[PDB]
Design a protein around this ligand. Structure first.
Ligand SMILES: Cc1cc2nc3c(=O)[nH]c(=O)nc-3n(C[C@H](O)[C@H](O)[C@H](O)COP(=O)(O)O)c2cc1C
Ligand SMILES: Cc1cc2nc3c(=O)[nH]c(=O)nc-3n(C[C@H](O)[C@H](O)[C@H](O)COP(=O)(O)O)c2cc1C
Ligand SMILES: Oc1ccc(Cl)cc1
Ligand SMILES: Oc1ccc(Cl)cc1
Ligand code: NA
Ligand code: NA
Ligand code: NA
Ligand code: NA
Lengths: 404, 404
């Protein structure tokens, strides 16, 4: 059903805010949203160019790209997700960032590394194993699938971890700059690689990268520090989902509670800020959502207040913010401190002009879960067309093609 | 009466355009509009800071400041107009440009030099004469007023003309950069100094700066060339009013027709553009308006088509654009070539959110000529308040004060 909403025009959501070196004119953000409309070699597509373009029209909006692979070893989806490790990737992304910039808006690329959840068959075709902090699986079924194709998950060696910092993420960061991205965002959420390092259920290492809270965080902070020297701290963000149980993270049931793990990390980030190396923003997933799954209040084991108490900089929050529409009471409380951005993922898929809709209180078009992850233009760029001009069968046939 | 208008949202007026090194998100511009709310020593005021601030809220709008004196010799108004020749001027203007920039918008400062119309009593207090290309007056009454105070107008010497280029305008340009202006605009319109040099009714010099079309244009093009090396051509604009008879310019009745004078100038500018030194924009006053005076179609002796035929770059047109409201037929024709901006001066005085009003077709608030040039806040910043919250008598008493 369509969502009735009150206008946010006169609210804090339309007061400017400096994020790193850029100033946003709205605090409404499009968070990273995997859609699988890249090309098969992971170069961004014609569809993506229009998709991000359509969402940049309120000048000074921040868009954050869908999860984007830092390297071949970082991949592992069956669907076609984009990458940022070759010149070809960067050149195509640049067409997209150019287009977003021409509307006066900004773009962060979220750098992902799948880790233990990488599809073992997909990785095998690259001649690679699924890798992680430790040799674990998100489920018995995951274990069986990998062993069935003779491609079991394996713990990265200490040298391989070093290579992530000085090769994989370094090159990705450089390509991202070539591609004209305003920020790079470390994906440390939702049970992917960096989250796997952070929490004890997924990291039982006995080298310097595991065995204590501090050691588990070491890789992430090494990435922060090293990439800060490469691109500048002002071009860096990071996403965490302290409460999420997506991809079998134990969260509040782990042997170390998320409040401990993530307060450690956030306080280390603030100490860097106190030294003049403060990153641009911390992105946090509100406990209403775990990955792409809504969570009942009964199952919510905590909140993200600690992030606001410990970190003094910009925070981006996302997770079913329309749950108290039309009045947006929570959203309004959350942005009242004047350093908080609010993200809408799902509704941005069906409302390319979402910032405008929220500004003037225009009914939201419902989203279509059925077409979140399909391989063609239907349910993708079709939301920018008038309903009656859409040729469904043609659009289902429209797969991603090269930009121009 | 309020002006009914149709929405311009879907029109060319809300397509982005690069002007010099910046990209505007609207083609609606606020043209230079003298209001006399500066401080008495010509430092910009608290009132001005809010005034320009209020007009910058549609992100990516270009604002052009009211005429701003390049030097003491450039002044000559009884009212309090701003300057840009001291550090104090620049520091105060910087607070204003900072504020406009924080909304994602841009600002050009129009650099004026009064010349032969400078008030002789005002100039006398500075120990200066009114100066010009030649010793002429706009009227017999002007002549009598100057001679009565023993301060007659005098022709600048050749060396003084050189000083304009390498001292007066150079310093003004440098202060403007210190002040964070995105552009500087040479005021070559409305019978002020540069216009006085351009046209034969006001320039009868026998040195290199007069005696032919080419010589009369020499100063202006010397300014263009020299300031291009100082601030970059991309930060330069110029205003001309070929058809205007403001301050007794003969225009179509002069011994050289404006089509000749101004086509010469514009073609020289384009030749600079062909060499990679193209200035940011040419601002032209449409023949519907002469200075601040509306002109009947009967008295219109020509149009500005020649500017579009000769110049390939950005053009800004202004002059009673609402005359064919609500449909805006002329405005729409004029911006159809995709390189043209359209300016609204008078309606911007009474509608600080004019870009927003034009975007969504909101009735325009009528302007108040009575308070165009008065010395206090009434009829100035009061248009940003709700009608019933305005304490008239208090506001009439509110004169400009120091920023903070
Ligand atoms: C289809 C879909 C794809 C998503 N892809 C990503 C992603 O690539 N990276 C990420 O950090 N979160 C991803 N998310 C999670 C969202 O960014 C977001 O946090 C979540 O959907 C809650 O916000 P919402 O209620 O406005 O949708 C995705 C969510 C959905 C529904
Ligand atoms: C009160 C007032 C002050 C003005 N000041 C300037 C000025 O300082 N410099 C300038 O080039 N034109 C000035 N103009 C002329 C305007 O920029 C503009 O060209 C004219 O008003 C026509 O546009 P409009 O019909 O939208 O008002 C002024 C006009 C008015 C009415
Ligand atoms: O972190 C992520 C990444 C992809 C998806 Cl579909 C959901 C969450
Ligand atoms: O060029 C100008 C300058 C000031 C005024 Cl009021 C009108 C026109
Ligand atoms: Na735009
Ligand atoms: Na908050
Ligand atoms: Na703003
Ligand atoms: Na035109």
């Amino acid at each position: 059903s369509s969502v009735k909403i009150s206008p946010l025009k006169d609210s804090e959501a339309f007061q400017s805010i400096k994020v790193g070196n850029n100033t946003l004119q709205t605090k409404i953000v499009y968070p990273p949203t995997t859609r699988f409309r890249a090309l098969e070699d992971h170069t961004p597509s014609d569809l993506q160019l229009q998709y991000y373009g359509d969402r940049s029209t309120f000048p000074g909006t921040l868009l954050i790209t869908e999860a984007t692979f830092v390297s071949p070893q970082a991949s592992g989806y069956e669907g076609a997700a984009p990458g940022i490790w070759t010149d070809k990737h960067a050149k195509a992304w640049k067409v997209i960032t150019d287009k977003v910039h021409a509307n006066g808006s900004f773009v962060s690329t979220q750098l992902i590394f799948l880790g233990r959840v990488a599809d073992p068959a997909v990785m095998k075709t690259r001649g690679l194993n699924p890798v992680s902090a430790s040799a674990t699986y998100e489920s018995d079924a995951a274990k069986e699938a990998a062993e069935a194709v003779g491609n079991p998950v394996r713990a990265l060696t200490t040298q391989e971890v070093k290579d992530l910092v000085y090769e994989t993420y370094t090159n990705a960061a450089q390509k991202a700059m070539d591609a004209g991205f305003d920020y790079i965002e470390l994906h440390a959420a939702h049970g992917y690689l960096l989250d796997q390092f952070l929490q004890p259920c997924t990291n039982q290492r006995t080298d310097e990268y595991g065995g204590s809270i501090e050691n588990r965080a070491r890789l992430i902070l090494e990435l922060i520090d090293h990439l800060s020297t490469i691109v500048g701290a002002d071009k860096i963000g990071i996403r965490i989902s302290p409460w999420a149980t997506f991809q079998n993270m134990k969260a509040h049931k782990d042997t170390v509670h998320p409040l401990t793990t993530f307060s450690y990390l956030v306080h280390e980030l603030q100490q860097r800020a106190d030294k003049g190396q403060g990153i641009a923003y911390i992105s946090v997933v509100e406990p209403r959502v775990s990955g792409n799954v809504d969570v009942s209040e009964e199952d919510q084991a905590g909140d993200n207040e600690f992030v606001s108490k410990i970190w003094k900089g910009v925070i981006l929050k996302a997770g079913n913010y329309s749950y108290d529409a039309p009045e947006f009471k929570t959203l309004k409380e959350d942005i009242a401190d004047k350093r908080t951005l609010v993200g809408f993922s799902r509704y941005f898929t069906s409302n390319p002009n979402l910032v405008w809709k929220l500004r003037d209180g225009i009914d939201l078009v419902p989203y279509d879960r059925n077409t979140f992850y399909s391989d063609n233009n239907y349910g993708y760029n079709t939301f920018s067309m008038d309903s009656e001009e859409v040729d469904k069968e043609l659009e289902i046939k429209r797969v991603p093609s090269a930009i121009e």
